[PDB]
Amino acid sequence: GWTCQFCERTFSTNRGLGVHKRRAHPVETNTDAAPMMVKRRWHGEEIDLLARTEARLLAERGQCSGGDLFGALPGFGRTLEAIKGQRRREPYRALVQAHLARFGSSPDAARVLSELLEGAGRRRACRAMTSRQKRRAEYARVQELYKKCRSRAAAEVIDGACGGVGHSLEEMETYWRPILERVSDAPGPTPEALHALGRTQLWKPISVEEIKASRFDWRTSPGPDGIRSGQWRAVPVHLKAEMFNAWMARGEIPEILRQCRTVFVPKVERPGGPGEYRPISIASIPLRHFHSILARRLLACCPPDARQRGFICADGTLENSAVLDAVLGDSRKKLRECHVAVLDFAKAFDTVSHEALVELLRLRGMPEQFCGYIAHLYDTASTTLAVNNEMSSPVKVGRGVRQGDPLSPILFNVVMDLILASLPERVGYRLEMELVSALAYAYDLVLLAGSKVGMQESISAVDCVGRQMGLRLNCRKSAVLSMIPDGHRKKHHYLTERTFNIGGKPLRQVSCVERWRYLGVDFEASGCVTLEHSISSALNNISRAPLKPQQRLEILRAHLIPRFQHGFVLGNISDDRLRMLDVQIRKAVGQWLRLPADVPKAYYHAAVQDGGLAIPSVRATIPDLIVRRFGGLDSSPWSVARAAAKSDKIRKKLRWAWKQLRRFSRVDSTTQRPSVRLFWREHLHASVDGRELRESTRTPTSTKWIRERCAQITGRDFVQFVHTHINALPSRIRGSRGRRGGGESSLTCRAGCKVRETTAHILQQCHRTHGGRILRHNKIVSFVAKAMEENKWTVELEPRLRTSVGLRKPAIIASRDGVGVIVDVQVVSGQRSLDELHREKRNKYGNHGELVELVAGRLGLPKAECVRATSCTISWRGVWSLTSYKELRSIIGLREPTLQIVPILALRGSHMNWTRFNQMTS
DNA sequence: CAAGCGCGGGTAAACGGCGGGAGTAACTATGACTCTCTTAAGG
DNA sequence: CCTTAAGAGAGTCATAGTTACTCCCGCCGTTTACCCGCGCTTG
RNA sequence: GUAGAUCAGCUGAUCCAAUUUCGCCGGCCGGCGAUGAAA
Ligand SMILES: [Zn+2]
Ligand SMILES: [Zn+2]
Numbered sequence A: 001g002w003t004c005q006f007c008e009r010t011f012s013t014n015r016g017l018g019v020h021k022r023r024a025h026p027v028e029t030n031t032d033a034a035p036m037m038v039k040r041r042w043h044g045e046e047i048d049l050l051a052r053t054e055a056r057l058l059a060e061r062g063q064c065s066g067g068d069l070f071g072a073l074p075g076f077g078r079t080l081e082a083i084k085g086q087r088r089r090e091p092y093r094a095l096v097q098a099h100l101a102r103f104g105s106s107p108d109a110a111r112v113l114s115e116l117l118e119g120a121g122r123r124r125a126c127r128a129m130t131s132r133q134k135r136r137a138e139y140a141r142v143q144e145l146y147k148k149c150r151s152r153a154a155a156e157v158i159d160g161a162c163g164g165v166g167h168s169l170e171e172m173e174t175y176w177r178p179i180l181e182r183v184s185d186a187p188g189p190t191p192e193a194l195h196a197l198g199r200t201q202l203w204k205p206i207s208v209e210e211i212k213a214s215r216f217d218w219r220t221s222p223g224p225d226g227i228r229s230g231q232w233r234a235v236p237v238h239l240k241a242e243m244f245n246a247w248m249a250r251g252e253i254p255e256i257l258r259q260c261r262t263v264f265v266p267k268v269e270r271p272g273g274p275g276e277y278r279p280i281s282i283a284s285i286p287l288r289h290f291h292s293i294l295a296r297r298l299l300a301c302c303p304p305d306a307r308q309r310g311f312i313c314a315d316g317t318l319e320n321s322a323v324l325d326a327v328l329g330d331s332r333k334k335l336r337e338c339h340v341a342v343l344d345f346a347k348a349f350d351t352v353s354h355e356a357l358v359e360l361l362r363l364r365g366m367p368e369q370f371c372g373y374i375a376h377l378y379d380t381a382s383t384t385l386a387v388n389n390e391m392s393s394p395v396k397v398g399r400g401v402r403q404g405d406p407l408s409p410i411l412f413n414v415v416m417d418l419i420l421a422s423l424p425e426r427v428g429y430r431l432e433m434e435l436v437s438a439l440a441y442a443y444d445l446v447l448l449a450g451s452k453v454g455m456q457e458s459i460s461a462v463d464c465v466g467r468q469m470g471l472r473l474n475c476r477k478s479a480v481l482s483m484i485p486d487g488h489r490k491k492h493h494y495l496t497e498r499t500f501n502i503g504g505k506p507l508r509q510v511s512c513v514e515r516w517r518y519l520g521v522d523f524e525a526s527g528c529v530t531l532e533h534s535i536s537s538a539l540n541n542i543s544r545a546p547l548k549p550q551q552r553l554e555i556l557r558a559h560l561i562p563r564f565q566h567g568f569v570l571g572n573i574s575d576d577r578l579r580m581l582d583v584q585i586r587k588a589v590g591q592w593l594r595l596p597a598d599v600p601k602a603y604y605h606a607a608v609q610d611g612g613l614a615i616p617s618v619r620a621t622i623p624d625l626i627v628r629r630f631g632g633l634d635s636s637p638w639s640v641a642r643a644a645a646k647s648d649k650i651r652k653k654l655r656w657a658w659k660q661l662r663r664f665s666r667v668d669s670t671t672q673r674p675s676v677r678l679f680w681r682e683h684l685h686a687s688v689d690g691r692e693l694r695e696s697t698r699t700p701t702s703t704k705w706i707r708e709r710c711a712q713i714t715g716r717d718f719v720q721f722v723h724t725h726i727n728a729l730p731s732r733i734r735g736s737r738g739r740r741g742g743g744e745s746s747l748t749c750r751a752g753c754k755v756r757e758t759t760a761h762i763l764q765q766c767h768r769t770h771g772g773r774i775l776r777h778n779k780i781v782s783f784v785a786k787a788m789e790e791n792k793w794t795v796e797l798e799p800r801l802r803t804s805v806g807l808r809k810p811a812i813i814a815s816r817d818g819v820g821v822i823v824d825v826q827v828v829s830g831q832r833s834l835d836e837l838h839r840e841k842r843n844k845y846g847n848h849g850e851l852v853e854l855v856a857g858r859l860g861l862p863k864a865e866c867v868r869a870t871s872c873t874i875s876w877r878g879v880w881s882l883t884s885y886k887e888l889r890s891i892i893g894l895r896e897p898t899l900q901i902v903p904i905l906a907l908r909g910s911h912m913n914w915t916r917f918n919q920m921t922s
Numbered sequence B: 001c002a003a004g005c006g007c008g009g010g011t012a013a014a015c016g017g018c019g020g021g022a023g024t025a026a027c028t029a030t031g032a033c034t035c036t037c038t039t040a041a042g043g
Numbered sequence C: 001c002c003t004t005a006a007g008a009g010a011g012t013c014a015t016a017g018t019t020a021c022t023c024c025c026g027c028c029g030t031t032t033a034c035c036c037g038c039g040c041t042t043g
Numbered sequence D: 001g002u003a004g005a006u007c008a009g010c011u012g013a014u015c016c017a018a019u020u021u022c023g024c025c026g027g028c029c030g031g032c033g034a035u036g037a038a039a
Helices: A014-024 A026-032 A044-061 A066-072 A080-087 A090-103 A107-128 A131-146 A150-158 A169-181 A191-197 A208-213 A229-234 A237-250 A285-301 A317-334 A354-363 A368-379 A408-422 A452-469 A535-544 A549-570 A575-593 A601-605 A618-635 A639-645 A648-663 A676-684 A715-725 A759-764 A769-788 A834-846 A850-859 A882-890 A896-919
Strands: A263-266 A277-280 A338-344 A429-431 A434-436 A444-449 A479-483 A822-828 A869-875
Touching: A014 A026, A044 A066, A044 A080, A044 A090, A044 A452, A066 A080, A080 A090, A107 A237, A131 A150, A150 A535, A150 A549, A169 A277, A191 A408, A208 A237, A229 A285, A237 A285, A285 A408, A317 A338, A317 A429, A317 A444, A317 A479, A317 A549, A317 A618, A317 A639, A317 A648, A338 A452, A354 A368, A354 A408, A408 A452, A429 A639, A434 A639, A444 A452, A535 A549, A535 A575, A549 A575, A549 A618, A549 A715, A575 A601, A575 A618, A601 A676, A618 A639, A618 A648, A618 A676, A639 A648, A715 A896, A759 A769, A759 A896, A769 A822, A769 A896, A822 A834, A822 A896, A834 A850, A834 A869, A834 A882, A869 A882, A869 A896, A882 A896
Parallel strands: A822 A869
Antiparallel strands: A263 A277, A338 A444, A338 A479, A429 A434
């Protein structure tokens, strides 16, 4: 008889109806879950602020009471009677007395840099002086990007919308240029704040050892200097040290190397307008390299605050995000009030007054020389916007802190330390007895509080210190999530109406179903739930983008995968959804590669070395990533993370991930650490198609055509190389995988070899194909022959020698300082171990004796033992032979690229044989 | 100087946080019962 | 002189586990709406 | 008609093919630069 009032469904009992609303109709039951606030319990933060206000009030006046405390506390939300009845409590009066007591207290270097600066200045002066054609233009653009700064073209394609900004210099310059030019009027930090913050030598000559000890990824865009990676790599380390010391002592860099080319980058996948682009600054390469060493020095010498884990976020978002999920889950399980403010400091990197930064650096203990250098550098900052090959008039910066400089994120860390210390001390969440207040990600700040008044006080504190620093707290992207349980009913509930005011302009309140992201992670008022299946759109964007099949596979390999498994890891996903995602990815790859549907699953997800296509399968690589990232939580130096590890939700997720990884991996022999690569290798070298693909593991270069060298193979050539590699050729037996009720004519060779029509039969022993076989053979031997004549060998192919036994035909011979070069070329099957075939071909030459003496007489080598027979063997699937690999690596000296290209030749010859057979199929 | 108002001690009569107890809608793992595909050796 | 009695790999789908909730009863600690004055102000 | 082919009704769409635009040094012809997203 019980029926829902929102879905008119019938349920046997009211309990089932209640859970029905809770799962089916969240918003209205959330409204029905709002608690009455008649006699709200007094939480510790209210006690603290009440006692501190009385302490001050008193000290300043001598005698005060609730009638004055209402005036001093407008938004406290407690009546004049509640203040009195609470005031009489003994711990409170003692705590007031506690705060009352506390409150009552080389010429060559010069020449080379002159040449480089002259070249840069010449370049600067020169720079200062239909649907079908639309697609062909996108092809030119995307290819010219993809062979360079690949993460550019990749992001541009997964968000493929002709993503070259678009909004134009116009609409951009009108938005940002006034902001970038307007000098902040920040008064600076008040002495009280500096005293609160108060609760180490940097300037020193550079060292070459630390110059090489500095990591620096050379895969970096130049600036407007026109100094690219290569010419700065040409600069030696001692010269680098000399110039760095010169600039270090002088304190100034040549003007040319301090310019910028500001470029605009979206934050959300769909750019709504000019207010969604981060104006990143790109300076010279030499400046960036010099600055990264100082950045490391400052990071090591002066570690940040304990609660500051945002500028080490290369592997630091793992802790902040994990702790956030843990605290949200804890507040849900034990029904404890929790207010979380997600404040945004985007655009705050360009609103830090130099007048406010210089003295903050001065009074933090930094040396005067360093402060002066930073002040000078930021005083003469001049950028030139560039969008889609169009460049603004020069713009003079007036708010400093360039989002693309090595020091910018650590020089902002001191402002972060100030603002972090500004907040009240005893405000936050007691997660497992440990107090957590702010997980300050470099960009997204987050404030945690127990009660409304404490959260509002923290908001006011951050606003005040931001205003003193000149920082503007944008009220658009910032939000507040409130979790106020209903006592006496054990119902969790979230507020809806806006309550907290960030210096006025009330903030947005998130709710049960509204989706929000704290640094790209799906979130909600209940916690991390799931991702919104944007993979389909990304795959579609890749498919329509003008890419070759190898470039699509590489983008899917390296860029989309990590991008989305980051959120997958921080998310909560069932393995069924991971399986569906894996299937979708597999089908998309099949469409891009024209592979049939009978290809084994392991082929896609096997490692490159093992012969597969990589393509990290989420179903197995996600539990591995979760286990790897959450194993060290219990050993985290930061105590809050250790406390969060105790939360049952994290433990449950870790247990589930361990189970899945155990099911989908094999224990390595050496490290005794589970690995999925072994799992996919074992599965791949088990199926009928993959059985021949066995010796690839022992030979590293055999598969170097899949990922390393897949830049010279054409799209058609690549998609047939992949077809042949996994034996995708549609022979009768291959097509018989499902249908064998037809007569054995349909199972037997088309040309009439009266045997089972196997693919190997087609390539290697069908009569017609013989021709193509020889065409491959010659090709191969000719190719490796050239190697001899770039290794200084007197080569000669096919020795026409008639031994007493008969007419044995060697492939090539050569000579250089002795050492026989009796080399045989073989392209073999894969059903027999390549090493035994190599031995069988080797012994029939070396142990012949008569042939040995014959070739010795032909070459004229003085000693019969001075010769050395050998054969290079590779299966038609393109797998090298280990013994031959070492043989031509060691004896007949050769560089590895030459042996790297042989598989390409072998695969090309094999598929050429197939196409020849198919066109003489008659 | 008496009456009125702001400033503080006392009472007590509903909030509310929690323990104990019995359940279930909605997914979400499988255990296990049905349909296809595969190497040889011995009298 | 070719087989053939077993092996070993998924299937929609049935069934059980599990996850995140539910509502009722009762209990003691909490909180603040009144009540009762004392000290300063005002007529 | 497309850089080329192909499926369509001079136009559209798909490809295993597909280097667009500007400046410059020069002879419709060659070469160079710009067209180069963070740490
Ligand atoms: Zn309903
Ligand atoms: Zn044949």
